[PDB]
Design a protein around this ligand. Structure first.
Ligand code: FAD
Length: 647
């Protein structure tokens, strides 16, 4: 109940957030019980919205739907309700309005980009009564959530999975858009470059190795301050190499201590065979004497009294000859490993790297080893899902009733303390251009776009140093996919995933994974790490060929017709994107995502914020995702409304 609401809202259910404390400075300085009441109303209200997010949740509705000691402080409830509504915590996505939108509209805002962050914010601003318009360079909305659809085929070339619903706003949006989510089975059989499979231990041993290795990386950073080596920020790749070497080293040592023992023992067997050989010389000599044989009766008794002493010693040695050799054996039969890495084991340990690079959108040498997991104390509760209906349904549903200008690429953004102007061009006819006047501009331009040195969008006035330093510092990875549409299915339906073991450590992530989750005859081969960019420079036919080759190596040549339809993404070559999403670069931190979020005041000639930023690269705890983009939009729509409503 109520407690699960605060959760689905990324909110403490017994504490007040820094924000809530600022907007309610009275309740914070005020007693406790009162607060406890606040938290309840707050929690209850979210429950109500969360229980049915397909219809607007009004103050009035929030009043009779209450317990009896609460439905009485009308004022607090209203305060709380407005707070929640303002910040996009209780009235976002696509819902039914019960009260038509005002006929006239306060301010004027221009939003650059029809991505999820764009549509999300525009949608908020529109209900806050502002005048919004969106300029999109492409001929469709969604942006980095692209959906391929031909015949009965449908696949996501962009965003593909919903990473859990526990606290994920995509849960609300999901029930609003009517989204068909299907869980992804946690099972991936790894096949080898030659065409065939991995035992099991092989996988269990490596995956184990992967984990422990990655654990070290962590231990060295936080626990040891190992992130600034030779006036340079330490990389993940770096640490992964430091680590492996010390493990490669431990192996050498053991192979040496072993070799030493084996050696010593061999030398002792030699020094014994010698002592034996030289003892028999003495023995044999007594059997020469014993044969020639009162002092002949006491002589024979003595020589045989001695010859039984030497012989009793020759047995001592024969006892060592056995106890030593015995030990000699042990060492050759139970000897340690030659390497910590087989030409194969490594080639497999790579996969787990490729996979890691695929998740991060960039090779490890580029990840700030110190900060690549600040976003982890913020993950969702639940199995990761997919959208077999096409993630494109979310943005297409949010794009309803909005003034969106497609095929309109922005070239310049001028902003002053008297207003702002946006200049764009028709991507279908450069002959015609446009000018848009507005009070505020909301930039949701991909970070890979704000990085093109020969700029695609010129700001006037250009933009402070701190803003650009952040842009230069932050990372923008790449990651692509191949779509294979087949006549029929030729792989286990029980198999959602399954990887390709790459030959070289440099080509670790080239077609290192195949998806099938598409409860249909559709296959997705992925490209991560260094292969991402590079491969974008290859004809589709050639890329497909490599795929069929890889697959034919698992089900043999004939259980694999040619695809009926095929598609290849190239998010780096795409002008409207210039990559996949952000990643914490070696010399950057979460603080940089905060800088990218900070708005810009344009004077003077007493200034007010005119240029605002939202997008997958402006949200600290949820970067590189669809929910981060959507949350960023809701964040700015609030900040903007807060600036232009009152003043
Ligand atoms: C291959 C791939 C797989 C992914 N998988 C996942 C996943 O499983 N889960 C997840 O949560 N996220 C995933 N993402 C990331 C997710 O899609 C993005 O985080 C999200 O789309 C970002 O939204 P946005 O609004 O910030 O920007 P975008 O959607 O990139 O939108 C910015 C918009 O501005 C437009 N634009 C650019 N320049 C101009 C211009 N000059 N004038 C006008 N318009 C312009 C763009 O065309 C675009 O429509 C993936 C991304 C890629 C590339």
């Amino acid at each position: 109940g109520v407690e699960g609401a605060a959760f689905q809202s990324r909110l403490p259910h017994d504490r007040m957030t820094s924000q809530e404390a600022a907007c309610f400075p009275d309740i914070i300085s005020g007693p406790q019980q009162t607060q406890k009441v606040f938290l309840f109303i707050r929690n209850r209200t979210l429950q109500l919205w969360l229980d049915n997010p397909k219809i607007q949740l009004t103050f009035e509705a929030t009043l009779q739907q209450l317990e009896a000691p609460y439905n009485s402080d009308t004022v607090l409830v209203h305060r709380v309700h407005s707070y929640l509504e303002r910040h996009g915590l209780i009235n976002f996505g696509i819902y039914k309005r019960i009260k038509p939108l005002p006929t006239k509209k306060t301010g004027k805002v221009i939003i650059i980009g029809s991505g999820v962050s764009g549509l999300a914010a525009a949608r908020q601003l529109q209900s806050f009564g502002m005048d919004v318009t969106l300029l999109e360079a492409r001929d469709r909305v969604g942006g980095r959530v692209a959906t391929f659809r031909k015949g009965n085929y449908v696949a996501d070339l962009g965003a593909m999975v919903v990473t859990g619903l526990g606290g994920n706003p995509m849960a609300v949006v999901s029930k609003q858009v009517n989204m068909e989510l299907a869980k992804i089975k946690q099972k991936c059989p790894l096949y080898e470059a030659n065409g065939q499979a991995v035992p099991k231990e092989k996988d269990e041993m490596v995956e184990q190795e992967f984990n422990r290795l990655l654990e070290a990386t962590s231990y060295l950073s936080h626990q040891l301050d190992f992130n600034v080596l030779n006036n340079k920020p330490v990389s993940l790749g770096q640490a992964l190499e430091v680590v492996i070497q010390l493990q490669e080293k431990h192996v050498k040592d053991e192979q040496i201590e072993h070799w030493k023992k084996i050696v010593k023992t061999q030398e002792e067997l030699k020094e014994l065979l010698n002592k034996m050989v030289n003892l028999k010389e003495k023995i044999k000599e007594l059997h020469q004497q014993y044969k020639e044989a009162i002092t002949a009766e006491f002589l024979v008794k003595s020589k045989h009294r001695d010859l039984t002493a030497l012989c009793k010693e020759y047995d001592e040695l024969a006892e060592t000859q056995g106890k030593l050799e015995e030990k000699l054996q042990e060492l050759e039969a139970n000897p340690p490993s030659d390497v910590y890495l087989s030409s194969r084991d490594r080639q497999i340990l790579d996969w787990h790297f490729a996979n890691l690079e695929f998740a991060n959108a960039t090779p490890l040498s580029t990840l700030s080893l110190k900060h690549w997991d600040q976003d982890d104390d913020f993950e969702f509760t639940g199995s990761h899902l997919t959208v077999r209906n096409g993630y494109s349904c979310v943005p297409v549903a949010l794009a309803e009733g909005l003034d969106i200008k497609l095929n309109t690429a922005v070239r310049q953004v001028q902003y002053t303390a008297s207003g702002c102007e946006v200049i764009a061009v028709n991507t279908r006819s450069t002959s015609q251009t446009f000018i848009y006047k507005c009070d505020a501009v909301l930039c949701t331009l991909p970070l890979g776009v704000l990085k093109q040195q020969p700029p695609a969008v010129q700001f006037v006035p250009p933009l402070p140093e701190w803003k650009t330093s952040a842009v230069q510092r932050m990372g923008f990875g790449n990651l692509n996919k191949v779509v294979l549409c087949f006549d029929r299915v030729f792989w286990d339906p029980s198999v959602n995933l399954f990887g390709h073991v790459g030959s070289t450590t440099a080509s670790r992530g080239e077609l290192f994974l195949f998806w099938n989750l598409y409860k249909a005859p559709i296959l997705l081969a992925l490209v991560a790490g260094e292969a991402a960019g590079i491969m974008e420079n290859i004809s589709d036919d050639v890329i497909v060929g490599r795929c069929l080759a890889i697959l034919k190596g698992i089900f043999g040549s004939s259980a694999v017709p040619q695809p009926k339809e095929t598609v290849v993404s190239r998010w780096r070559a795409d002008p409207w994107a210039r990559g996949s999403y952000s990643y914490v670069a070696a010399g950057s931190s979460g603080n940089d995502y905060d800088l990218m979020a900070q708005p810009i005041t344009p004077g003077p000639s007493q200034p007010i914020p005119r240029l605002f930023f939202a997008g997958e690269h402006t949200i600290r705890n949820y970067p590189a995702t669809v929910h981060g983009a959507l949350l960023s939009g809701l964040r700015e729509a609030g900040r903007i409304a807060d600036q232009f409503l009152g003043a």
